Design a protein around this ligand. Structure first.
Ligand SMILES: CN(C)c1ccc(C(c2ccc(O)cc2)c2ccc(N(C)C)cc2)cc1
Lengths: 109, 109
């Protein structure tokens, strides 16, 4: 009966490291939720970045990694670049289906 | 424009084995498209079934398997059960985004 939780907005300094987190409203997020992350720039088609908590696609920037941090799924963006300014969407899953968070708007300073 | 193509409708008998395919209109499908498969039973929330072409979730019945077959991605359903009757969607992606096929209606009699 849980929903996916994401901080609405988050900032980072250029060259800085920022951690986006994705939570469950009822409990802890584990690797059993197979967290996926998606990047979206306004008006544009969303792009898949991370699957199965920490797996990258061939096109996933080396700067980006997924992991579990505490009771949450986490997307770490190292060495932030201007082109990383986007909405980041988290999806969590179980046997009853998959749900999306409302996204985090990342601003690069 | 580019599209992902699935057969609209396929029929298998209980106990049978059936192949659903997922093609790309702009070339062969490779593991580099990271094919995902999803299932929507009538009245139910969509579930994820297969990702990265052939990886299963802990809740994916072992009678489902994903593979590359000819120039296409494929979802092979063996020992088909009544409950396997559902709409099946595949999705393919590249550096620019992901596309869903139109869905395959699987009828088990
Ligand atoms: C297991 N979990 C949490 C999960 C898995 C896959 C997806 C997903 C997806 C994307 C859009 C959508 O409307 C529905 C699902 C998706 C679609 C395509 C791709 N590729 C790489 C083709 C990846 C993820 C969402 C959540």
């Amino acid at each position: 009966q849980a929903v996916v939780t994401q901080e609405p907005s988050v900032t980072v300094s250029p060259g800085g490291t920022v951690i986006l987190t994705c939570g469950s409203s009822t409990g802890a997020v584990t690797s059993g939720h197979y967290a996926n992350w998606f990047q979206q720039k306004p008006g544009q088609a969303p792009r898949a970045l991370i699957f199965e908590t920490d797996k990258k696609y061939s096109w996933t920037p080396g700067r980006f990694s997924g992991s579990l941090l505490g009771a949450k799924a986490a997307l770490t963006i190292s060495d932030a670049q201007p082109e990383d300014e986007a909405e980041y969407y988290c999806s969590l899953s179980d046997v009853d289906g998959y749900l999306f968070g409302g996204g985090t708007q990342l601003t690069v300073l």
